[PDB]
Amino acid sequence: WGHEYVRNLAGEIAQEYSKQHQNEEAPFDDLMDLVQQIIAFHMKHNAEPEAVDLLMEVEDLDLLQEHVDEKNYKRTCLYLTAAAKYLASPDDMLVLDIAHSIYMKCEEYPSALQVSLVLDNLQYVKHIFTSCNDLLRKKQFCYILARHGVLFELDDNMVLDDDEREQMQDIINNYKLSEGYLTLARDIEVMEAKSPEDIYKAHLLDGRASAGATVDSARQNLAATFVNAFVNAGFGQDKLMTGPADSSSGSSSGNWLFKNKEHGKTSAAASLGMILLWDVDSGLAQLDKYFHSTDNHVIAGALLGVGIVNCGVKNDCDPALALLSDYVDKEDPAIRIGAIMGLGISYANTQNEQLRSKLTPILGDTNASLDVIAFTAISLGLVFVGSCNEEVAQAIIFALMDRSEADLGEPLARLLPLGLGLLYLGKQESVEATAEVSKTFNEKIRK
Amino acid sequence: AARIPTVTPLTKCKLRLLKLERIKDYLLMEEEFVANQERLKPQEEKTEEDRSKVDDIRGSPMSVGSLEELIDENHAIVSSSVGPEYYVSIMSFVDKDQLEPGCSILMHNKVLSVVGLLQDEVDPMVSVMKVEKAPLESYADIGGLDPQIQEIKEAVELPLTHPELYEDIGIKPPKGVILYGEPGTGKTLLAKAVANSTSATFLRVVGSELIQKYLGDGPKLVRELFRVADDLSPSIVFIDEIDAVGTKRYDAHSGGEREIQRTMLELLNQLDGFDSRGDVKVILATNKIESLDPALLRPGRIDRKIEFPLPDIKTRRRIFTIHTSKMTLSDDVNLEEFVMTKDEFSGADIKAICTEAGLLALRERRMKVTHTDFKKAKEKVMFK
Amino acid sequence: VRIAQGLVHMGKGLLTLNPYHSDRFLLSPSAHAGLVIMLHACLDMKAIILGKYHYMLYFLVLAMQPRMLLTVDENLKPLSVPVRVGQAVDVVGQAGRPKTITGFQTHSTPVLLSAGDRAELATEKYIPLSSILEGFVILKENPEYREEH
Amino acid sequence: PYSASIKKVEKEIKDMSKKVNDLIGIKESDTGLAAPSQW
Ligand SMILES: Nc1ncnc2c1ncn2[C@@H]1O[C@H](COP(=O)(O)OP(=O)(O)O)[C@@H](O)[C@H]1O
C-alpha cells in the first residue's frame, strides 16, 4: 500500500499504544503482530529511523534484536546512539544495553566496548573480551581502555598465554605512550626545548620597557617556572632545569630552584615531575637527586613530581605507593599534602582498597590541618570517581559535620563538597540520597 | 517581537524542539526575574500610576509645534506656532528618533517642555501621485505585441520576480526603460499591465506636471517627486508625456525656455545624481522623442529603449478578439472585413471602433451588434 | 597571563585538555575531575592560587593527552600511512554512504588531530580495526587488496 | 509522526510570549510616544 500508509499507521499505532497504556484493558498481541510486520517492512526498505521510533513509542525495543541484518546494523545503531543522548537516565540505560546486544550479535566488538564504557559496567567489558578470539582486536581494546583510564586486570580465564597477558597488561599500563610521544616529537622535529623567554618574545615588548630596573620578582620567577614546565612537558630535556652546566662555573644546577621561596620551591620541583611525564625510569632517578634536599618543601615537591610522572602509567613494582606511604605518616603538613596529592594523581580512577584504608584514618584525624584534610578528600574523590562507594561518601560527610563555623568561611571548605561530588561523577540517580543527606549540612554550605 | 528568526530547520528534527525549549526556558526565567520586583518592592501599580503621572507631568494641553534642529543634551530649538522660536528641551519619553526638521514637537502646557511627537499622515506630493488600486487586469489584457512584455518584465518584474537570477549573474537590473511609440500606441496600456502586475510602490506623473508657473518651482516638484518615491519604498514611477518638457509653451510659467531647461536638468540630476537613490526604478514613455533632451537618455540614466509599433495585421486579430470579449455580437458580420478597413489602424482604433459599434447598437436598444453598426462606426472613427 | 601563555603553548602544541574521546561520546572521569578541581580552585583566585596553593594547578596533569594518531602494524611497530583529516559531519539520516569528514587533504603518519577533526584512512591497503581513528590504531593488511600496476 | 504535537506546542509558546509581554506593557500604540521602559 506504499510507504505513506505505513508511516501513518506507525503514527496512529504510537497514539493507540499511548492511550491504551492509560487504559490497561486492551489485548496487546494483535497490536504486537502488526508492529512486528511494520518493523520487518521498515528494515527491508532501509527506513530504520522510523522503525526505531515506532519501537520506542511501543517500548518493546527487544524486537530489534531479531530483525537486524549485517547491512542494517550500522545505521540502526548510530540512530540508537544519537537518540540515547536525548533519552534520560533510565530510558538511555535500556537503549544502550539494547545497542550493546545488537553490537554483540553483529560482532563489532569496538562499538560494544564503547557502549559498555558509557554504561560503566565491567561485566559487559568482561563478556566482550571473552567473546573475542582475535588477538589484535584484544590489543586495540586494551589501548582504548588505557585511553579511557580504566584498569582492566585480565583474568587467567581470558588468555591462555602468559606472554600475551603480560603484553596487554603493558599496553593497558600505557608503557608505549611515552615511546609514541617521543617518536612523534622526532617526526615533527619539535625536540628542541623552548625557553620561556622565546614564548615571551621580549624583543617585541622592549619598545616601552627600556626604563624598567631589572627586579626579578619571585612571582615572575614562579610564572617562568610554570610556563617552562608547561611548554617542555614530556620532552625529557629542559634548558633551565636540566640543562648542562656548560658555563665556567662549578655550581649545583639547583641555582634557579633555590631562587624560589617555600611553595615556590615546591612548584619548581613539580615542574621537574611534569618535564619527565610518562617516563618513570628517568623521572624517578632525577627526582631521587632532589629527595636528598634538606628542605621539606623540596621533598614535598619531589613527591608530587613522582606522583605526576606515574600519572596514567602503572608499574607492577608500584613505586608510587611504596615511596609515598612512608611520607604520608610524617608530621610535616607540607610533606603529607604532597604525598597525598601524588597518591591521588597517580592512582586516579584505580579504586584501590589499600589507598582507601590508608587515607580514611587521615580524614578522621582532628589534629590534621585543614589543608591536609581538604587535599585528602580531593584525592579520595579522584581515586574513587564514579564508584559510588558509600564508605568514602560517609567518611567525607563525617568530616563535614565535625567542622566549626569558623572553618566553613575559608575557601578550602569548598573543596570537600567538590571531592564528595567527584565520588559521584557520572551517576545521576544515585545522588538524590546524598543530596537529601547533605540537606542536613549548615545553611552556609548546604546549598 | 523578533525574538528568534531561525526557522532553517523546517522539519520535525530535534533541533527545532531544542531551540523552542531553550527559548521557552529563557522567557520563563525572564518572567520569574521580573515578577519578584513587584512581589518585593511594587511601590506602585506600574500600569496606570505611571501613565497618570506622565500625563500630569507633561503639559496636559500639548500644542502643534515644529522641530527645526537637534540638541542631544536635554535641549531643543524650535519655533512657536505663533512664530516665537523656543528652546524646549527633551523629555523622558522623547524616543528621539524623529528628530528631523518639520515634525511637530509637542511641548508642555505648564513649562512648555517637549511632551509628544507629531505623528505625520500627509505626504501631499506622494498622495497626489500614489496609485491606490490596480488599474487593469493581468498582462494578458494588453495583447498582440509582447516584444516588450518579456523585455519590460525583465526590466521591472524580473528584478522583483526573484532577484537572485540577476544576482547569480553578477549584475543589477537595467537602469530605466523609455517606451516611445506612435501616438496612441498603447504605451499607457503598457503601464496598465505594469501596475496590475506590479508588486512595489508606483507613482504616476503627468508630463506637464513637472513644469510649474512660478520660476524655480519645477525643479522643486522634481526633487519632491524623487524624495517621495525614493523615501517611501521601492517604487516604479512613470513620468508619462516626457515630450512636454519643452514641446508646449504656456504663459502661466513666468520663466521661458530656461525654466523647462532647468526642470530637465533637475530631473536628470534626480535620476543619476550624486548619491544612492536606492532601489527605485523609472519607466517613462513619450510619443515625440525627437525633441527630448539628449542628456536624459544617455545609458546610465535611461537604459532600456523600447519601441511600440502599430498593431500588426496578425496582431490586429488578437487585439480585436480581446477588446470585444464580452460583446454579444451577432454572427452577421466578420471582423476580418473591417480588419483591413484602415491601412494604419492603430490599437486605439480597434477600441474606438468597438465602442462606436456598441453605442450605435445602443441607440436602437438592440441586443446584439450588426455589421452596419461596425460599418457606420468605422467611418465615424477614422473619418472626421 | 603567563600561566595562560604557558597553557596555550602546552607541549608546544602536542597535548590537549580534552576530557572527551571518540567523537565526544566518551567522557574520561579522571580528566573531568582534574579540570573541575582546577576550576573550583580558580573560583577563589586570590586565596587559593595567589596564596599558598599554587600547586593546585597540578590537578591539570590528569586532563592532558597527546594529539597523536599513530598507525601501528601487527608487529607493534609504527607505520606511516596517508590519512585524510577534517571536520566530522553527522551522518545520521543521510541517504547513501556519506563521507564522515569534510576535506580532501591527505596527511601521512601522525596527523595532529584538532578538536572535532575526524580521520579516515586514504588507502585501502590496510583495514583499520578501530571504527574511530584516534590515538593508537592497529592496521591490518588487507588480504583482498591487489596492487594496480 | 507527531505533526500536531509540535505545531500545537510551538503555537502555545508563541501565544504565551505575548500573553506575558502584555503584562509588563508594550501595547497601547501611541502617536509618537516612547516605551514605558524608556521614560
Ligand atoms: N491591444 C492594444 N494595443 C495598443 N493600444 C491599445 C490596445 N487596446 C487598447 N489600446 C488603446 O491604447 C491606449 C493606451 O494609451 P496610449 O496609446 O499610450 O496613449 P498615448 O500614446 O496618447 O499616450 C488606449 O486608448 C487603449 O484603448
Query: For residue B229, which of B200, B186, B197 has the smallest C-alpha distance?
Result: B200
Please compute, for residue A197, the number of CA atoms within 13 A of its CA located in the half-sphere on the CB side. 5
The rounded distance, in Å, linking the Cα atoms of B224 and B188 is: 23
Name the E strands within chain B.
78-79, 85-86, 105-107, 114-117, 176-181, 201-205, 235-239, 280-286, 304-308
Chains D and C touch (3+ CB pairs under 8 A): no
The rounded distance, in Å, linking the Cα atoms of B351 and A179 is: 97
Query: What per-residue string of b and e applies to A111-130 under the rule 16 or more CB within 10 Å gives b?
Result: bbbbbbbbbebeebbbebbe
Q: Name the H helices within A59-195.
A: 73-86, 89-106, 109-119, 122-131, 135-148, 162-172, 175-188
Contacts of B84-92 with CB under 8 Å at 24 or more apart are B86/B112, B88/B112, B88/B113, B88/B114, B89/B113, B89/B114, B90/B114, B91/B58, B91/B115, B91/D39, B92/B54, B92/D34, B92/D38, B92/D39
Interface of A with D in 90-129 (CB under 8 A): none
Contacts of C1 (CB under 8 A, 6+ apart): none
Atom of ligand 1 nearest to the CA of B318: 1
Residue A310, Ramachandran bin (φ over 0: left; ψ between -120 and 50: alpha; else beta): alpha
C-alpha cell at A122: 565491567
DSSP class per residue in D1-39: --HHHHHHHHHHHHHHHHHHHTTT---S--SS---TTT-
Which among C6, C65, C138 has CB closest to A226?
C6
CA A85, A91, A95: angle at the middle one, nearest 5? Answer: 70
The amino acid at B127: S
* Helix/strand number for chain A, H first, E second: 24, 0
Distances (CA, A) of B65 to A110, B61, B83, B84, C82: 81, 12, 10, 11, 78
Provide the experimental method for this PDB entry: cryo-EM
B16/D6 Cβ within 8 A: yes
Contacts of B300-304 with CB under 8 Å at 24 or more apart are B300/B175, B300/B272, B301/B175, B301/B176, B301/B268, B301/B271, B301/B272, B302/B175, B302/B176, B302/B177, B302/B178, B302/B271, B303/B174, B303/B175, B303/B176, B303/B177, B304/B151, B304/B155, B304/B174, B304/B175, B304/B176, B304/B177, B304/B178
Atom of ligand 1 nearest to the CA of B240: 23
CA of A1 to the centre of ligand 1 (A): 59
Distances (CA, A) of A349 to A149, A299, A345, A422, B266: 7, 26, 9, 11, 84
Question: Are residues B208 and B244 in contact, defined by beta-carbon separation less than 8 angstroms?
Answer: yes
Preferred mutation among C16, C35, C62, C90 to probe A, highest tally of A CBs within 10 A: C62
Distances (CA, A) of A43 to A63, A70, A76, A80, B348: 12, 11, 9, 14, 71
For residues B191, B196, B199, B200, the Cα torsion angle rounded to the nearest 10 degrees is 50
The rounded distance, in Å, linking the Cα atoms of C74 and C14 is: 25
D2/A10 Cβ within 8 A: no
CA of B185 to the centre of ligand 1 (A): 5
Question: Are residues B369 and B329 in contact, defined by beta-carbon separation less than 8 angstroms?
Answer: yes
Among chain D residues, CA nearest to B35: D24
Instruction: Please give the DSSP secondary-structure letter assigned to residue A429.
Output: T
Chain A contact present for D2, CB below 8 A: yes
Name the closest-CA residue to atom 3, ligand 1. B347
Task: Tell me the backbone φ, ψ of residue D10, rounded to 5 degrees.
Answer: -65, -40
Distances (CA, A) of A58 to A36, A279, B162, B287, C53: 11, 55, 47, 77, 56
Instruction: With H, G, I as helix, E, B as strand and everything else as coil, classify residue B278.
Output: coil
Helix (H) or strand (E) holding C139: strand C135-141
10 Å Cβ neighbour count for B301?
18
Please compute, for residue B73, the number of CA atoms within 13 A of its CA located in the half-sphere on the CB side. 0
- Report chain B's C-alpha Rg in angstroms: 30
User: After which residue numbers is chain B interrupted with C–N beyond 2.5 angstroms?
Assistant: none
The rounded distance, in Å, linking the Cα atoms of A187 and A180 is: 10
The rounded distance, in Å, linking the Cα atoms of C108 and C81 is: 5
The rounded distance, in Å, linking the Cα atoms of B233 and B201 is: 6
